[PDB]
Every structure is written in structure tokens, then in C-alpha cells.
């Protein structure tokens with residue numbers, strides 16, 4: 001039998017929803033008659049690398065790595081050092097670019113922020129995710145680029161560092177309100193923080209969306225059911241997983257590495273978003 | 278280093294988020310590698326998953342079964358010297374190899390806490406009826422009523438599917454037929470239910486009190502904040518990983534620990 005190996009970091013948040021990604025990977029492997037193995041990549045570059053080798057030494061025939069910590073170059077070196085088909089999710093490779101399936105998180109963020117600016121929002125708050133996360137880093141970069149491209153000055157008092165948890169959302173908002181710098185819209189780097197933030201705003205008697213419009217990322221199942229319904233950036237996780245797993249199985253059947261279908265999210269517009277007052 | 282193998286069918290890869298995070302974290306705090314295999318869609322495939330991991334030289338196995346029966350699981354246990362344990366299922370012979378929560382009892386106790394606070398007409402939204410947890414929560418609800426001794430009304434009960442959309446749909450159904458509290462089988466459903474109540478302009482908790490099960494991270498941040506039954510998932514994972522490694526470390530098996538849920542009262546509930 002052929003086995004597909006998955007390596008995924010033990011982080012509380014994942015930019016590509018983990019149970020969703022695992023579900024579609026498992027389903028795809030099952031339908032194509034492959035066994036699936038997932039190894040804990042744990043929580044550092046070194047352990048992500050060791051988990052890849054571990055799976056090979058279990059005779060996995062192909063590997064999908066979803067790494068938080070390994071640098072692009074480290075990933076390219078891994079791919080080159082091995083004969084088995086190895087592909088990377090959520091990171092864009094420099095040398096082995098056909099081995100990546102990636103979503104331009106920076107662009108998605110730029111797009112959500114640009115939408116706020118074109119709806120009339122000049123003073124936009126931003127809640128970051130953890131600073132060790134590529135996805136968090138890209139979203140923040142897309143926020144700063146959207147401001148700078150629209151001739152809006154960057155003010156770090158409008159950026160609150162968060163940790164992907166609802167609590168960090170509520171606390172990030174309380175911190176921004178105490179800072180006193182005015183804002184008409186808030187972009188949270190995931191839905192959990194956006195929900196925490198809507199709570200703290202409601203508690204402080206700040207109307208959403210009337211006084212502050214809110215956007216998250218992830219488009220979680222509860223987003224249409226928050227009060228008010230949460231506008232959110234949807235990532236094509238399912239598509240992305242079917243691509244990388246489908247390609248890895250293609251390789252095992254004699255396929256070759258063809259150029260990348262790249263991906264982008266879409267902002268889903270719900271009641272938490274409107275023009276300023 | 279030693280490896281702990283985890284067999285979980287993909288039909289459960291939708292609580293699962295928690296288990297994976299916590300099993301991995303707890304394996305790393307103890308210096309072990311976690312490896313997971315997919316139990317797929319049959320007793321034979323779950324069995325084969327376990328054997329697969331063993332033949333890859335995992336040192337101990339945890340399974341979260343869907344298809345394999347306990348008779349079947351007890352026999353797998355007897356046929357292997359490697360520690361093999363089961364999460365969320367009660368074993369008959371090797372009960373010490375089991376980590377399980379009495380979902381029917383904690384459901385009972387939560388609904389009872391509603392009765393004692395003054396509720397008499399209590400609505401109930403089920404999870405998917407192929408899930409034992411779903412069965413047991415319904416069961417615990419019907420027991421608390423019958424025993425209080427409020428008489429079961431099948432009009433106060435709707436079928437859900439564990440999703441927020443199904444919670445809203447369930448409430449929509451219920452509204453086209455009188456209750457002061459609503460019990461949702463998970464938070465996700467509770468949240469969709471509160472959305473449908475708000476949409477209809479039914480006041481929560483003033484008109485309808487709402488509780489869920491799971492106590493998810495977002496619960497305190499909903500509007501109103503969601504009252505929920507906290508299951509000790511983290512503690513149960515710590516227990517199963519801890520016990521396996523105890524076996525590996527040379528220790529031995531022990532009578533199973535009892536885990537109970539607890540109702541956390543928030544703004545979405547009153548007496």
C-alpha cells in the first residue's frame with residue numbers, strides 16, 4: 001500500500017483550518033486507496049524537519065508539509081535532499097515553486113482593507129495574530145500596504161498585537177479604546193479575535209457596525225450567527241487541500257510537477273460591515 | 278523516542294480540533310512523538326489502523342472508535358502486549374484501558390439545574406442521531422424531566438446536526454409550535470439558536486434562557502454570553518496520554534478516573 005504523510009505544527013491556530021484540511025486530505029487519500037499518516041511537527045523548525053524524516057523512515061511515499069517555522073530555503077533544501085514527492089502548504093517556494101500550494105494572505109488582507117478604504121474608512125484598526133505565524137505576518141503586511149497605497153499614514157497606535165484567542169480580541173479592543181486614537185473600522189486577523197472584539201465593543205457601548213465596522217478571516221461556521229453577523233475572509237481550504245493532496249497522489253502515479261494553481265480568499269460581506277457615519 | 282499512535286476515523290474530523298491540539302501538546306510535554314492514522318469507515322478499517330501503527334512500531338495506541346464494538350476492542354487489547362486504550366467508550370473487560378465521560382449523566386445534571394432554578398418548560402436541540410453522545414444527552418434530558426416529575430413533550434424537542442445553521446433551523450421549527458429555557462447539544466447549535474431567537478425578537482434570557490455543551494473559547498464573548506456545560510476534554514486527554522506513558526514507563530493499569538461536566542452560568546441564563 002502507498003502511504004501519504006502529513007506534517008503539521010502543534011499551534012493553537014492555523015491559517016488553513018486544521019480539522020477542515022485534515023478532513024479533506026483524509027477523504028482524498030481514502031478515495032484514492034492510500035493510507036494516511038499525520039505526524040506532530042511539534043513547535044519549532046528543527047522539529048518540523050525531524051517529523052518529515054520520521055515519516056520517510058516509516059516509508060511514507062509522499063509528504064505534505066504544513067510548516068509554521070521552517071524558512072522557505074530550509075523547505076527547498078528538504079525537497080532537494082529527497083527523492084520522494086514532498087509538497088508544502090501555505091508557503092511559496094523560491095526554487096521548487098511547483099511543490100507549493102499557497103494562498104496569497106497578504107493580498108487577501110490588502111483586498112479587505114482596500115474595500116474598507118473605498119467604502120470611506122480612513123481610520124482603520126488592526127488586530128494581529130501571533131508574531132511567529134507567516135499567516136499573521138502576511139495579513140499585517142497587507143494592512144500596511146493598503147494604507148500606504150491609498151495615501152493613509154501608518155499609525156501603530158491603531159495596531160494591537162493579539163494571539164488568535166477571543167480573549168486577546170476583547171483585550172486588544174479594550175487597549176485600542178484606552179489608547180484614544182479614533183477608528184471607524186477594525187480588521188481582526190481571525191474570526192475568534194473579531195468576535196472577542198465585537199464583545200468588548202458592545203460592552204463599551206460602541207455600535208457595530210454603526211460606529212465600528214468589523215471584519216475577520218477564516219469565515220468560521222458561526223460567523224453568520226454572531227450578533228451582528230460577522231463579515232469574514234474565506235480561504236479556499238477545500239480547494240487547496242484537494243490540489244496538494246491530488247498532486248501528491250498524481251506524482252505517486254507517475255505524474256510530474258506542473259505549475260501552481262495559486263489561491264486567494266474572498267471577503268464575505270455580512271451585517272458587521274457598513275460605511276462610517 | 279517512543280511513539281504514541283492515535284486512530285481516529287475521519288468522520289470525526291469536525292472537539293476534534295481540541296483533541297489533536299491537546300494530545301500532541303501532552304505527548305510533547307512527555308518527550309514522545311504523536312502519530313495519527315485514519316480509522317476510515319468500518320470496524321475492519323479501524324482495526325487495520327491500529328495494526329498499521331503497531332507494525333510501524335508505535336509503542337502504545339489510543340483509539341477513538343466509531344465502528345468497532347467493545348467486544349472487538351477488548352479482544353484487540355488481549356492480542357497485543359503494547360498498551361492500547363480507548364477514548365470515549367466504556368470497555369467491559371479492560372475497563373481500566375478506557376477514558377470516558379458519562380454524557381447522559383452530565384446532561385441530566387445540567388437540565389436538573391434548570392428545573393431547580395425554576396424552569397418547567399424546557400426545549401431541547403439534539404446533535405446528529407448517529408452519535409452516541411447525541412443519544413446520551415437527549416436521554417439525560419428526558420430522564421431529568423420524567424424524574425422531576427415533568428412529563429416529556431416531544432414538541433419541545435427538535436433534531437439538529439451539530440452545526441450553527443441546524444441550531445437556528447431547530448429554533449425556527451420549535452417556534453411554529455412554549456418554553457422558558459432551551460438546551461442545545463453543543464455550543465455551535467446554541468449560538469445559531471440564539472441568532473434565530475434574536476431575529477424573531479425573542480429575548481434571551483428574559484424570555485428564553487439558553488445553554489449549550491462544550492464551553493468553547495468564544496462562549497463568554499457571545500451576545501448574550503453563552504451559558505455552557507464544560508466537559509473536561511483537556512483533563513481526559515491528559516489522563517489517556519498519561520496512563521499510556523505510565524504503561525510504557527513500566528507502571529501498570531489502574532481503575533478508570535471518573536470525569537464529570539459542569540454547567541457554567543453566564544448572561545444567557547437566569548432563574
Ligand SMILES: OC[C@H]1O[C@](O)(CO)[C@@H](O)[C@@H]1O
Nearest residue numbers: 289291292293408410439463
Ligand atoms: O461536531 C462536533 C461534535 O461531533 C463529535 O465530535 C462526535 O459526536 C462530538 O464529540 C462533538 O460534540
Ligand code: NA
Nearest residue numbers: 011012013130
Ligand atoms: Na498559534
